[PDB]
Design a protein around this motif. Structure first.
Motif, mmCIF file in Angstrom:
data_model
loop_
_atom_site.group_PDB
_atom_site.id
_atom_site.type_symbol
_atom_site.label_atom_id
_atom_site.label_comp_id
_atom_site.label_asym_id
_atom_site.label_seq_id
_atom_site.Cartn_x
_atom_site.Cartn_y
_atom_site.Cartn_z
ATOM 1 N N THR A 46 38.813 36.340 -54.656
ATOM 2 C CA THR A 46 38.418 35.029 -54.158
ATOM 3 C C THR A 46 38.801 33.980 -55.187
ATOM 4 N N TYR A 80 35.080 30.901 -46.750
ATOM 5 C CA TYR A 80 34.998 29.872 -47.772
ATOM 6 C C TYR A 80 33.560 29.421 -47.938
ATOM 7 N N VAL A 103 36.993 30.154 -51.659
ATOM 8 C CA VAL A 103 37.625 30.764 -50.496
ATOM 9 C C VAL A 103 37.852 32.237 -50.786
ATOM 10 N N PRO A 121 40.077 26.309 -51.558
ATOM 11 C CA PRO A 121 39.156 25.458 -52.309
ATOM 12 C C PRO A 121 39.907 24.316 -52.976
#
Lengths: 77, 460, 460, 460, 77, 77
Positions: B204, B321, B243, B75
């Motif tokens: 994440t 993602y 992500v 990200p």
């Protein structure tokens, strides 16, 4: 399309007319001497289905997809 | 500088607007609705497949990622809304990003402290920052804490790669190559293929949505460069937001025995069946692996018991993602829709019917059947079938096995224990309707005329 | 310098425009749909061939690399987008390269160890740089790191080798060249060869996309320098965006038998049939180290089991790469195709059938047979076949031999226990149709004329 | 000066131009359109040859390293494109050579000990440079040195020599001269030659990209110098880029038995082949050579057993070569063609086939055969033949011996139970047609009249 | 191609017609004495299939694929 | 390339014909009383294909590439 429909059971099955989507196929049955061919819903085609819509118990029947293609003599004897 | 850049950029991206969910809509196979029923006969088996249009319309923002795109997965980058963005082949860009922060889901905090930032992101910079935070938390507390221990174990009939494109995303098209899915054997009623996708989340990463457009570029971003960069309504900028991180396992159970029992088979292993599993053609991909590489009866059991219990043995790999239209700053969702045929996977088989008569009375069986048949075109029909042993006398014992085939339907039985009385010389011992097919059915009678008792054994 | 050079190179390449999937597409073998079914009888064996067309058109962006391509591949290096890139015929450029940060993906590094930067990118410089980054982690943490990355377990039949170049990639044409893959045999229905790729990616390397075209040149690219370096519109300049690394192998199995139980052999070696093993004729190119050299049931099992993880010494070689159109920094992608009349070949064993009547009664047998053949014109036909000894009596004990040949199919049997009683002295014991092919079936009757028993043995 | 040298060399070399494959395409033998299958009989032997066209046009960019070409190992030895180069003859040139970075790659190598530079490239200079580098890495790490197991095992039918000029390359013409690949005998359809090349890389070398041709030259070269230096337009300069160094084992299995099992045999000991090897007198050659020239069982697994380590014991050779075009730094490659005949050959067995009719039930022996032959024209035929006493009675005990020649095919044997009934009086015990050639067969019948059994026995 | 398409099982064999995919096969069935030569589907051609679409258990049969070659005398008693 | 290319299940060869397509050889077959000579594809020449295209289990044959060398008496008896 046009299927056999006698509301009155008959051995000589003659009255065949163009009917609706309710029935699915041509169903002829024989109990003893009585014979009844009719436009019949093929899902509602079942040994028990026929015996309940006929109020009778013992019979021999046959329903075929294409209309008018159903008659008693195809049953044995 | 970056402020005039931000004001020009906000106007720019706000004018770059289009429907995100329709620039990102993947409408797949266009099928006519037809239900073609047709039966076939394996040597002793009666299969009936009614192919039917089954429309799988789907949309999501859970954009999965594989090996062939680990080069771009994190990200923070700036992407371009395009079919490239659609098919999970990310587009590059000569954008030098600007100061932005990054957030990291570290199990063991009590506030929003474990956060970081970069003044000018570069894949190396943000990558080493994130991996820094990851290793930092791994070396500190994960030795002595819990973790979400739950089972997300998706399954589906791999009827189509378009069906699987709508179910589990578009780029699976390439990633499913080694899966050994013969979805075409499903198309032709040869074999059945189910995928069991056990994804695996460990963590994440997220990123602060654009608060300043030029906080997404080096100080002084000009839209002239961006159209020189291709960043325009033609392919306007998109903002990665998250992500995932974890592992995966795509178990491919493919059996020649066409049935739904396939999934039970999987569930016979997840937690006779020997046979259904004996034609497994298991083909697992991974998105260490040695625990699966060996193969066992509890490999999934430990893969959730230990693998989903992911420890400091070795960290996982990026899994997925999501992104957001830079103007929108809101969730971006592809709509991967498809229609596809749906083979009716049903199947039926012959089964013996041991008409066994042992009673001390004179018994006579009449068995009536419904009869699946075809006429004059292959047209479907149902028929009466009458017993040949009807009107047929049987001794004190009469045991013959009727080849009562699953091609036959709706059996009904009557057994006569005849009596000596003149009035009604018949006595019913047993008569049944609404009884299903039996592989081996020892239908036995016993006792004498005054007490005819029954037996319905399935020796099997 | 690099600024005016950047704008010159950008004014040059940004106008240059073409589709990668058009210049980069490998549509190798085309074939008309020829549908040739055919048959062949061998000593105690039946054979059917189905030469049916099967186009295989694939596309991919992971451009393979093997031994004979090792040295010229590494990231950031410009290339000229041509068939050169297609068959992995990678061409260099004399252009001086400029300042670039170089990134790697390494599991476990700590906050400074995954990024470097080279002013004049050079195979020696960047190669020793990434080798340094490896030497960091190889001895430091290898004690407790198990990178669980892709254990890609890919299998396919080695059909027309252009379909292998399509499904697997162009450059295999060389690296699988020594695999002793018989092109004609499968193409002309001689033998069975199955190839199975096994991998484990170890890591990769990545470039930050040029924010400056002349951030790719050593400070001062001129368009006339670029063109004097051979770059033009036809073979445009692209820049590598990845190189991947890890353990790889392409293990084969080469045996007479069809009916992809060959693949059962492949896997249950990776995991009679003993003789399809005994007919190995393996030929494999690989990439302990001596159990590497011998090759057997335990060898691959261990090498993907204990050798798959990062070795005690070193990984192998670059595995793949990718590039990107300098114009828009658009990702590149191959498109490799091959059409061939796939022969899914199937065998049918010579059945044998012994007929044993040890029952006390005298049973009468009719054995109906199917027959698949042709009629003098290459036109197919299917026919009945009648038990010529039908209506015959068999002794109290009895056993005869019958070549239930591989030419026979869809059998049906009626056995008739003769009864001395008057009401239809023909008593049916056993009618059963649609049975499978048995190498040695034994139809042995039993019991008495009052209760005719039966046995359907398989002596083998 | 060196700048003007670079400019002039780039200019002329750009004006220099050629279809590089045209100058580097090769053809070997060529055969007219002949193909034929022919049989031959011998006292106690039978053979069928299929002499069919063998045609191969294979190519690469790996170039061999042999004595006549050993003169320019340590790559960077710029050549001039010639057919000498095509068939492995390089062109030395007393040119002032300029500084370039040369880099050799090793497993596990030190941080900065893969980078080298040489001011005046010369075999002595660069040789000492790489000597000292590999000596550093040989004293530093070779105690724990392990190989990336690059077992490039290769096997081919060495039926033709020009086939080994196309596939393995032109230079092999000399290096196989001691190996004695007697392809001519194969063409005469008498003797069988199978080559097995074990190869292995231990490391390899690399050179920086020449931004200039005079980036190779020392300084101040003029085009007319290189002209006088021999490298000209008709023989354009080719920029060597890599030499590969490692282990080889170049074995030729020489054996007459034309059962292709030889290519199993040649490798079955690297894993019947025993007896077919028993009288082969295998000849070997290495490119401890004398330890191979005698030949034993574990030579190859020794080429890794010792060939895992490097020592000061016995020479391991540079293994392959390569080079690229100078004009545009484009990769150079050969294109070698061969056209000749392959002869796929077989054999079939004459032996004593004994029919042992010893059963107490006098059976009648219908026996039938197919016979492939010719007469008086050489035009092919095959005919039916049948037993002498075909279906004719035999004594109670009768052991007959037949000089069962291997020239006939497709036998059928019906042994006949004799019965006196009317309905099908010909009773079958064993009628199996299309049965295998048993060189020495005790084909006996057995069992009782109520159970007649066959005996598919081999005498031995 | 042209299959023989008899309308109803009988010793008569004259009606030969150029048929559609229902000439996947030429069909001729001798059941007892009654013979029937129809257009047919070859993949749908088998003992079982023809015995169903002919409704009787015992049967003797031959299928050809080439034009009209499936014949009556093609069956032998 | 003039084999006997004339389909005849009789004791006499009618016309000697230069066939090419299915004259890779010429084949004659005696089954009991009947005998048949025709151009033939030599790879397709074998006992089993003959007995299939004949349905008779007792037979003898002779197939030869040479032109007309598959004449009748070249088959014995």
């Amino acid at each position: 399309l046009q299927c056999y429909n006698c509301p009155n059971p008959t051995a000589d099955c003659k009255t065949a007319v163009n009917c609706s989507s309710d029935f699915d196929a041509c169903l002829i049955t024989k109990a003893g001497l009585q014979v009844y061919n009719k436009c019949w819903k093929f899902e509602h085609c079942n040994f028990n289905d026929v015996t309940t819509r006929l109020r009778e118990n013992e019979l021999t029947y046959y329903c075929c997809k294409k209309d008018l293609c159903n008659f008693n003599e195809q049953l044995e004897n | 500088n970056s402020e005039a850049a931000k004001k020009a950029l906000n106007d720019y991206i706000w004018g770059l607007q289009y429907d995100k969910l329709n620039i990102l809509t993947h409408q797949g196979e266009k099928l006519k609705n037809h239900s073609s029923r047709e039966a076939f006969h394996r040597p002793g088996e009666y299969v009936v497949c009614e192919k039917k249009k089954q429309s799988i319309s789907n949309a999501t923002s859970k954009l999965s990622v594989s090996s062939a795109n680990d080069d771009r997965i994190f990200p923070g980058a700036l992407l371009k809304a395009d079919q490239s963005l659609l098919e999970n082949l990310p587009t590059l860009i000569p954008v030098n990003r600007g100061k932005t922060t990054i957030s990291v889901n570290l199990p063991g905090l009590k506030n929003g402290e474990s956060n970081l930032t970069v003044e000018n992101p570069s894949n190396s910079t943000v990558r080493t920052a994130v991996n820094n935070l990851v290793e930092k938390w791994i070396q500190n507390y994960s030795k002595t804490h819990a973790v979400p221990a739950r089972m997300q174990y998706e399954s589906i009939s791999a009827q189509s790669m378009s069906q699987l494109q709508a179910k589990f995303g578009a780029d699976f098209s390439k990633v499913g190559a080694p899966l050994n899915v013969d979805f075409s054997s499903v198309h032709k009623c040869e074999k059945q293929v189910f995928i069991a996708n056990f994804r695996q989340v460990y963590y994440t990463a997220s990123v602060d949505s654009p608060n300043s457009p030029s906080a997404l570029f080096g100080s002084g971003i000009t839209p002239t460069d961006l159209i020189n960069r291709g960043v325009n309504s033609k392919t306007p900028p998109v903002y990665v937001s998250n992500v995932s991180y974890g592992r995966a396992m795509y178990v491919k159970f493919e059996t020649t025995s066409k049935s739904t029992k396939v999934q039970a088979a999987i569930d016979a292993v997840v937690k006779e069946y020997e046979n259904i599993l004996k034609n497994t053609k298991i083909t697992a991909v991974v998105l260490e692996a040695s625990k699966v590489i060996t193969g066992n009866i509890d490999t999934l059991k430990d893969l959730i018991q230990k693998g989903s219990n992911f420890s400091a043995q070795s960290p996982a790999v990026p899994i997925s993602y999501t992104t957001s239209f830079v103007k929108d700053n809101s969730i971006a969702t592809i709509q991967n829709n498809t229609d596809y045929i749906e083979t009716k996977v049903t199947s039926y088989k012959d089964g013996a019917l041991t008409l066994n008569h042992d009673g001390a009375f004179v018994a006579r069986f009449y068995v009536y059947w419904e009869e699946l048949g075809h006429d004059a075109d292959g047209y479907e029909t149902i028929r009466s079938r009458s017993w040949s042993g009807n009107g047929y006398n049987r001794g004190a014992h009469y045991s013959t096995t009727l080849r009562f085939k699953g091609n036959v339907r709706n059996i009904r039985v009557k057994v006569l224990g005849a009596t000596g009385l003149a009035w009604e010389p018949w006595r019913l011992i047993y008569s049944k309707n609404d009884l299903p097919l039996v592989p081996q059915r020892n239908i036995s009678t016993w006792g004498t005329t005054l007490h005819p008792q029954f037996e319905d054994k399935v020796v099997k």
